[PDB]
Design a binder for this molecule. Structure first.
Ligand SMILES: CCCCCCCC/C=C/CCCCCCCC(=O)OC[C@H](O)CO
Ligand SMILES: CCCCCCCC/C=C/CCCCCCCC(=O)OC[C@H](O)CO
Ligand SMILES: CCCCCCCC/C=C/CCCCCCCC(=O)OC[C@H](O)CO
Ligand SMILES: CCCCCCCC/C=C/CCCCCCCC(=O)OC[C@H](O)CO
Ligand SMILES: CCCCCCCC/C=C\CCCCCCCC(=O)OC[C@H](O)CO
Ligand SMILES: CCCCCCCC/C=C\CCCCCCCC(=O)OC[C@H](O)CO
Ligand SMILES: CCCCCCCC/C=C\CCCCCCCC(=O)OC[C@H](O)CO
Ligand SMILES: CCCCCCCC/C=C\CCCCCCCC(=O)OC[C@H](O)CO
Ligand SMILES: CCCCCCCC/C=C\CCCCCCCC(=O)OC[C@H](O)CO
Ligand SMILES: CCCCCCCC/C=C\CCCCCCCC(=O)OC[C@H](O)CO
Lengths: 270, 270
């Protein structure tokens, strides 16, 4: 029973935590274990609802995303920055390259890192990195807006995205931290993290969906639909609220909260 | 036979490759396999001769290293930089923290990465990172000299040192690349890499020597002495020559050479 209610709860958790630097995997294993929804169907379910959150970024950054791949039909794209530069597809590619290289080489080792004890450590270490980024970032951002970003900043963020190969570390936490440490403002680094997440997660989800295509032909459709659609709406709200929120608060509260989630992981599983 | 001659050959290889961004582990497994010197005694031997190369940095950077820990008795230390700043022990600590955290957590996974196929990949990827650092570094260094380095640069270099946990990647390659990508000059980033190597390798060697303390009581003394002493002299020459060399050449030749070493690893073992 409550198959649709469980789908909506996980969809809310996915939509809130996928793009905030608080680790969706950590929250998924907790709530999934509390709701008794574990196993291959649950893991396949949580891969499907990730597409819902991806679509939220695609919808929110529609004009810029199609602009990046060379499709522009009408109104000029809003300029986000103090300089006359423009984010390009090269920025995105440099942001992808490091994690794509290491992810394919270390595929088998990453698969064995989904133990709750490894996730708990990744939550804490990811939280420590956010704090370090807040302590060490330059006083004056080098890239105030998304369109001020340089190839060097983008590649360095890509290098930090390799830390996200550690389950629980949070891709948004790793890339936002790297961006701030490269002098990208909190706002711009969050945006670039969201844009970078689209090609990274679509390829990763397509690889996960291909290898776990085994499910009920039509029985999982009601659950998968409700979860997918909920994650989309909540991610729309969360991203919009986060970008407005991060303009006047730091990542310290998110780092402290990750320490609480790590403690939650321990008590739930041990 | 040729126990002293084999010790000197490996000592030369250790002293040349330990602090150049060309991976000593890659060269050790090649030459060790060609000389038929493999096994627990050989692995213990190659840990001992690393102390010889460490001592070379200690001798070459004697005044600065003791200065960093607060021991200064007489002539003021030479100022290396355009600003009025000074490298401090905090720079060193920030350079150590990331690799120390991840190295202790991922200890068991790192132990299983010494397969020649993993070393070959690390040689290539490390070579690609050197090229990227050469392509993406700022036109004007932010830290021309060692004493111009900031806490942010030091911590970021520490983050890149985590890549060195991959056997074959080369600690010097990872940290020099990170430094150049943070706007530290080639010369200063090499120096900081050497200084950072002293606490990192002394702790790592002490952990390796403790767990492999099993050897011939006095039979290995002649081999271990000749190797240790050779690695010291060659590292003295190599470091001095490298620092003079890097002032007018880039790391491109070192990156190309790593690709040749990766091919050598394949042909020797496969
Ligand atoms: C990265 C390139 C995108 C590739 C994947 C394409 C999306 C996949 C299919 C979606 C069907 C639903 C289409 C819904 C279209 C919404 C467009 C929109 O709402 O844009 C509004 C405004 O421009 C912004 O706020
Ligand atoms: C276009 C080609 C794309 C190829 C893609 C290959 C990338 C390698 C795998 C990455 C996911 C596996 C890492 C596991 C991360 C889960 C832990 C986590 O929660 O981080 C996510 C966070 O919610 C977000 O902010
Ligand atoms: C990082 C702090 C160092 C801790 C570990 C200490 C070294 C270990 C013992 C060495 C015995 C041999 C001592 C040899 C002393 C050489 C000093 C020297 O030659 O310095 C010359 C000049 O100051 C520079 O070029
Ligand atoms: C003070 C406490 C210190 C604690 C120390 C814990 C560090 C973790 C282990 C690091 C070595 C294992 C990584 C294996 C690297 C071998 C591959 C290689 O060749 O890189 C070296 C290169 O020669 C150089 O430039
Ligand atoms: C950790 C694993 C990483 C291994 C993967 C490495 C692959 C090579 C990547 C990029 C090549 C370098 C691209 C250089 C782009 C040129 C940019 C430039 O020249 O300057 C920037 C511009 O002037 C201001 O925005
Ligand atoms: C939503 C976005 C998803 C997009 C996913 C990324 C797809 C990669 C696209 C192009 C790079 C193709 C690889 C070949 C690299 C060529 C880059 C290059 O040539 O840059 C030099 C520049 O043209 C100086 O004139
Ligand atoms: C049986 C299982 C019951 C599960 C019940 C699910 C309903 C949770 C709803 C909202 C809380 C969302 C929790 C995650 C909120 C994001 C974390 C966060 O952002 O905290 C940082 C801080 O707010 C920076 O200001
Ligand atoms: C990848 C694993 C990493 C996890 C480990 C993270 C541990 C926290 C590290 C450092 C705390 C921050 C130290 C902040 C030092 C203050 C520096 C500063 O405030 O500015 C610099 C100075 O003004 C100009 O040189
Ligand atoms: C060859 C060198 C090898 C040395 C190996 C490193 C040993 C660590 C030393 C001190 C840090 C001790 C950890 C405690 C961190 C305190 C740092 C701190 O307080 O910095 C603030 C500063 O004092 C603002 O006033
Ligand atoms: C049976 C085994 C026989 C083994 C014979 C051992 C004697 C090798 C002596 C010198 C070559 C040293 C090789 C490593 C040299 C460093 C690599 C390097 O620096 O190349 C980069 C380029 O020079 C940038 O200008």
């Amino acid at each position: 029973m409550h198959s649709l209610l469980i789908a909506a709860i996980l969809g809310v958790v996915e939509g809130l935590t996928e793009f905030l630097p608080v680790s969706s995997t950590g929250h998924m294993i907790i709530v999934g274990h509390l709701l008794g929804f574990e196993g291959d169907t649950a893991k396949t379910f949580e891969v499907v609802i990730q597409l819902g959150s991806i679509l939220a970024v695609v919808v929110m950054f529609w004009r810029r995303l199609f602009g990046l791949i060379g499709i522009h039909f009408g109104r000029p794209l809003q300029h986000e920055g103090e300089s006359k530069g423009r984010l390009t597809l090269i920025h995105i590619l440099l942001g992808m390259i490091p994690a794509v290289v290491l992810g394919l080489l270390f595929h088998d080792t990453i698969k064995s890192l989904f133990n709750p004890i490894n996730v708990m450590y990744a939550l804490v270490v990811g939280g420590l990195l956010l704090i370090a980024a807040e302590c060490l970032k330059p006083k004056e951002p080098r890239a105030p807006g998304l369109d001020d970003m340089t190839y060097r900043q983008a590649f360095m963020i890509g290098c930090f995205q390799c830390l996200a190969l550690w389950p629980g570390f949070s891709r948004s936490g790793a890339t936002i931290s790297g961006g701030m440490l490269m002098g990208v403002s909190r706002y711009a680094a969050s945006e670039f993290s969201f844009l970078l997440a689209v090609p990274m997660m679509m390829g990763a989800t397509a690889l996960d969906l291909y290898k776990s295509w085994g499910f009920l032909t039509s029985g999982d459709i009601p659950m998968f639909a409700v979860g997918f659609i909920t994650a989309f709406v909540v991610a729309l709200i969360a991203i919009k609220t986060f970008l407005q929120l991060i303009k006047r608060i730091s990542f310290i509260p998110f780092a402290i909260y990750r320490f609480i989630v790590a403690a939650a992981v321990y008590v739930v599983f041990f």
